[PDB]
Amino acid sequence: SGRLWCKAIFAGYKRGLRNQREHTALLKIEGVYARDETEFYLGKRCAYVYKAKNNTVTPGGKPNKTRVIWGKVTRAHGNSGMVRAKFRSNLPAKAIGHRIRVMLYPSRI
Amino acid sequence: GVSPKVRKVLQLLRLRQIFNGTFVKLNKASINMLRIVEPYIAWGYPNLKS
Amino acid sequence: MKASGTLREYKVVGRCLPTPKCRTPPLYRMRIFAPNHVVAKSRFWYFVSQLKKMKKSSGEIVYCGQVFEKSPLRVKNFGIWLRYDSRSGTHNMYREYRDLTTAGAVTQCYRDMGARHRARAHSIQIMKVEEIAASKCRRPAVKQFHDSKIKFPLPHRVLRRQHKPRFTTKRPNTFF
Amino acid sequence: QVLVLDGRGHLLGRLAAIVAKQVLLGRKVVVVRCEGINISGNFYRNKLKYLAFLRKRMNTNPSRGPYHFRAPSRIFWRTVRGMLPHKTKRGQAALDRLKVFDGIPPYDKKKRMVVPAALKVVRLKPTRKFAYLGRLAHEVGWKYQAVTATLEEKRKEKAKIHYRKKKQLMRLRKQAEKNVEKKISKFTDVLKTHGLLV
Amino acid sequence: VFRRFVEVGRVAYVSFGPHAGKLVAIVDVIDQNRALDGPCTRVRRQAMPFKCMQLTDFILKFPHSARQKYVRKAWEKADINTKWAATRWAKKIEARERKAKMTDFDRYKVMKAKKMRNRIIKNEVKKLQRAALLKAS
Amino acid sequence: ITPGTILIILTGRHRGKRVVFLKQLSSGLLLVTGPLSLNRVPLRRTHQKFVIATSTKIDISGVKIPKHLTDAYFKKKKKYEITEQRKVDQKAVDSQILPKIKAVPQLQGYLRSVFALTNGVYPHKLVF
Amino acid sequence: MKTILSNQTVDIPENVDISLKGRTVIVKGPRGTLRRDFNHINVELSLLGKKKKRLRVDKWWGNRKELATVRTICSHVQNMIKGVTLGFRYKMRSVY
RNA sequence: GCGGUGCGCCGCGACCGGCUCCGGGACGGCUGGGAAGGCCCGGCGGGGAAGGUGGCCCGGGGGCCCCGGGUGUUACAGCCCG
RNA sequence: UUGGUAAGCAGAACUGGCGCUGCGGGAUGAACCGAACGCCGGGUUAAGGCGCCCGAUGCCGACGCUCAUCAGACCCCAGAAA
RNA sequence: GCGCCGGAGCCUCGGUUGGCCUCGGAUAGCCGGUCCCCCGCCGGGGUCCGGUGCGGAGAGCCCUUCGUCCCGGGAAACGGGGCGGCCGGAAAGGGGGCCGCCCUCUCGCCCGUCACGCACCGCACGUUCGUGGGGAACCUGGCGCUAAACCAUUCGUAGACGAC
């Protein structure tokens, strides 16, 4: 009867001014605003959810549009709320400024 | 880019690359080597833990 | 010199090695100010080399144990004396403060001379740190805190903590 | 989903830089009441530096040239363009979420928010001078100040009369409070114990 | 306009940093922007900035400088402890911090008390409106 | 996690549900037991990692928890059907549990309802 | 440096009626009224006395060119009461 | 059954070892054998002055209390050194 | 360090560059500051940075100085005094 | 043959996972009350009482969802649910609520008793806004509608040809 994931926004690759690295992303988890705050989120599963023209089969459903890229939160980044990531499938840059779900499951409570 | 006296003295202490170190016993011949390379190194008197 | 952290206050007595011409040469003690013992003994070799004939190929140091405050709760008008190098000359001085530690004053000082004179701590000496009394004091600023029943209100309290909502419903307050 | 921002007492160069970032994350934003955004340092410094802007006209065919807008809507908009990567697709698109208006037309039965960091009271000492992008616009040839006023005056008349009613709304809850509080003793003393009222 | 003063006497609550959420007295105004202690409430004689301390409206009387035993007989005299549990200030401190305590199974059992508390009033708010209409004929 | 504390199953066809803990098997999996009645969840295993633990602990010292219900007996076979072996395992393991949940002030409107996220209501802050 | 307190006191006779709302001081006496605002100054214009017989202007923590303002507001309220009491009257002669 | 070889496509878990970044508990030594403060005005014994407590007058504003000066070494406060 | 008022000019000593050489930084670029390179995964750094453009202060970061009707904002460097 | 009103499937474009329906603004000062009294058309000041590290606090406020059946307790008894007056509103006009009725339940909202409901055998896109946008066609009735433009021919208030 509701949601079971936390909202966040892909906000560029890991990089310094003039050479970009594509094997690490950079998420802005919602309402989390220092380092202190970001222990929880470490290791915890994450998902980019999307929708191609043709039918992909699923597990636990019918063969339909919807697909995912899967990944993993690794460590904190900076001073201010941010977080790094490592999906198995390297992300599109379409998704810059679009939604991703961090889950709650591999919990440590 | 390194002056030709210093390349010779850093060789003799076997420090041939950056962030590398050595043990060195002390006397007058050992310090006056360590005043010629004294802007390519850091040294000091180590302890039972270091 | 860099004036990093706070400065400690140190006692470092330093005579010369006894050469055989007359058996015993004289000791010479000095209040130094510095954050560690490595710059409490090598900066001490710059002040003693100018008074006596004493560099470092003959010269040892006997002591360098940290000296502590002994009324480190009490307020004190210090009277510090200064020497400093301008772009156009050289100057001697007197210069006052308020703190609870002999050390802390000196530090406060190297931060004022940075602000009013663009002097950097290698053009700057403290010739005489000296604790002074109330009615003896000369200069305006530090005088006014000689008032037992001090009564001032903190008027326009500019707000700190501005990225704590980030966006909001209320325009803030600034009078408390 | 949509953010609204009364830029009254909100500075020029800063709101700019706080707004542009939300935009790039994917939020959509609306500013409103740009005829109040102010700017520090006194008006004969905000009129000159602005005038000398006007002077940059491509000499050989001035139609093509550096297009100087006049209205306090298009000015702020320009200084947000300045802090965006605007000749790429990702910048071009990020400007479409930004939408910014004169007066406060439509978008006026809404709660509209404030940034406290770009706020004048917080950010400038009280013995320092400053301009209004309002007047400044009316003294570089803006052609609608006194109309966006007379409209606005109207709408404060019609706010007061609502506020009026919604206090009297509060005069028949805070009293009913007292006309139920014996027969709501156990659903009024089991919130206290966690702290959602007192 | 002004009524709360940096007054040799004042008690100030501590906004942030280390000794946060403790009262503490004034003893010795060093400076322009830093003063000098709090013995009953677990704070050690030490200098303190002003850009951390919010004024309560309690002033206790001892001389303008005295040690930690003579400030014991000026703080155990006015009885500040008792009198900072009544303050409307420090019930909106402990009816805010009881919300961070709060469990899951409390959040939900507060939520069922909040669904049958604004149904009676919500009924009684309409029975005072449609009687105000009744009068003005 | 201790015996009798409250667990939130976060993954299968039951997800977000309030489920009780009974006994850790020697395969290492839990026994997350719903009182079939109230939730709609029977004897089942779930896995430490995919189960949040909660601060509530009604005691499970004095009742009885069966042996023969051991970790292989659960393990899969091949329209699986509820045979007449798992119906005295169903109501007798739970009717010893059921006199200790209703006795607490207002706890059988909470195991039945489902938890979920909304807003202002962030995972990293609250205690549960 | 930052001088802690500064102030000055203006005092009215047995003739005039003054008050305020912030720093906008009103006056009425034997021949008019006058509003003057000062809402551009940062001060404490506290009134005091029974039968309000003295104004008073403070200025906590000030540098040099804001202890100036103290006496200039102190001497603007002087030309408001001296004009409402007796009143102003320049004269001048035509020259050719 | 005991041995080796691996799965049709997509997946989860567990314990073992190498490399890193973190978080939490406890224990000893040093010094000026740390510096200062704490608790029995520590118990007898003198001296000193201010960012002058009592009080005493003068000035200046109200209901017997605050505000602005002077006097001077314990009185119905404290403070610095044997 | 020689000639020349001086030159992004002519001429010599010591060492180190560039030419032959890419890489972080100095918006910008043979010579300046960091470091010299087989194809890549984790980790920490140099010189430089941390409003947005742009990775990183979205610290209840410290004490001062300064108003400009031509303010100020970094080695070589790119505007000037009595 | 186009277009208003009220069943059955196909191509294609993707994004999202509950709502805040609003004083005017001061910052060396606010907010809420009832106001005895004086000036105004329900309104503005003055006077008195609360409060002020906002508790008439965006450190906020609302809604809240597994489903049914039997039997009681409280709340409600001015309620729940679906045809018509009559106004509300122009800066870029909202799927607004007051007043009769056809009708309609004693259920809805909280605490209990009564058991049952794929109990699919430890696991991934799970839950909405959504009757979503764009458009090839198939309907089924109901209400009702047969224009101009391009050109060619003509003008010279125009013209290199096009335009006018």
Curated annotation (Swiss-Prot), chain B:
Phosphoprotein among keywords: yes
Location in the cell: Cytoplasm
Any one Gene Ontology BP term: maturation of LSU-rRNA from tricistronic rRNA transcript (SSU-rRNA, 5.8S rRNA, LSU-rRNA)
Subunit description: Component of the large ribosomal subunit. Homodimer. Interacts with DHX33.
Top-level taxon: Eukaryota
Modification N6-acetyllysine occurs at: 25
Function, as annotated: Component of the large ribosomal subunit. The ribosome is a large ribonucleoprotein complex responsible for the synthesis of proteins in the cell. Binds to G-rich structures in 28S rRNA and in mRNAs. Plays a regulatory role in the translation apparatus; inhibits cell-free translation of mRNAs.
Keywords: Acetylation, Cytoplasm, Phosphoprotein, Repeat, Ribonucleoprotein, Ribosomal protein, RNA-binding
GO molecular function per UniProt: RNA binding; structural constituent of ribosome
Span within the parent record: 60 to 109 of 208
Sites bearing Phosphotyrosine, chain numbering: 40
Record PTM N6-succinyllysine, positions in chain: 28
Protein name: Large ribosomal subunit protein uL30
GO cellular component annotations of the record: cytosolic large ribosomal subunit
Organism: Oryctolagus cuniculus
Family affiliation: Belongs to the universal ribosomal protein uL30 family.
Curated annotation (Swiss-Prot), chain C:
Chain residue numbers at which the record places covalent cross-link Glycyl lysine isopeptide (Lys-Gly) (interchain with G-Cter in SUMO2): 11, 128, 170
Pfam families in alphabetical order: Ribosomal_L18A
Keyword annotations: Cytoplasm, Isopeptide bond, Phosphoprotein, Ribonucleoprotein, Ribosomal protein, Ubl conjugation
InterPro entries listed in its UniProt record: Ribosomal_eL20, Ribosomal_eL20_dom, Ribosomal_eL20_eukaryotes
Single biological process term from Gene Ontology: translation
UniProt modified residues of type N6-succinyllysine: 76
Gene Ontology molecular function, alphabetical: structural constituent of ribosome
Family, per entry: Belongs to the eukaryotic ribosomal protein eL20 family.
Function: Component of the large ribosomal subunit. The ribosome is a large ribonucleoprotein complex responsible for the synthesis of proteins in the cell.
Subunit record text: Component of the large ribosomal subunit. Binds IPO9 with high affinity.
Name of protein: Large ribosomal subunit protein eL20
Source organism of the structure: Oryctolagus cuniculus (Rabbit)
From Swiss-Prot, chain E:
Location in the cell: Cytoplasm
Top-level taxon in the UniProt lineage: Eukaryota
Example GO molecular function: structural constituent of ribosome
Modified residue annotations for N6-acetyllysine: 77, 83
Keyword terms of this UniProt record: Acetylation, Cytoplasm, Isopeptide bond, Phosphoprotein, Repeat, Ribonucleoprotein, Ribosomal protein, Ubl conjugation
UniProt cross-link Glycyl lysine isopeptide (Lys-Gly) (interchain with G-Cter in SUMO2), position: 122
Biological processes per GO annotation: ribosomal large subunit biogenesis; translation
Modified residues (N6-succinyllysine): 83
Modified-residue entries (Phosphoserine), positions: 137
Keyword hit for Methyltransferase: no
Annotated GO CC locations: cytosolic large ribosomal subunit
Family (UniProt): Belongs to the eukaryotic ribosomal protein eL14 family.
Self-association state and partner proteins as the record states: Component of the large ribosomal subunit.
Summary of the function given for this chain in its UniProt record: Component of the large ribosomal subunit. The ribosome is a large ribonucleoprotein complex responsible for the synthesis of proteins in the cell.
Protein name: Large ribosomal subunit protein eL14
Highest classification ranks of the organism: Eukaryota, Metazoa, Chordata, Craniata, Vertebrata
Span of the entire protein shown here: 2 to 139 of 218
UniProtKB/Swiss-Prot annotation, chain F:
Modification type N6-acetyllysine: residues: 79
Source organism superkingdom: Eukaryota
N6-succinyllysine found at: 64
Name recorded for this polypeptide: Large ribosomal subunit protein eL6
Transmembrane segments: none
Family: Belongs to the eukaryotic ribosomal protein eL6 family.
Function of the protein: Component of the large ribosomal subunit. The ribosome is a large ribonucleoprotein complex responsible for the synthesis of proteins in the cell.
Complexes and interactors: Component of the large ribosomal subunit. May bind IPO9 with low affinity.
Organism annotation: Oryctolagus cuniculus (Rabbit)
Full-protein interval shown: 147 to 291 of 291
Localisation per UniProt entry: Cytoplasm, Cytosol; Cytoplasm; Rough endoplasmic reticulum
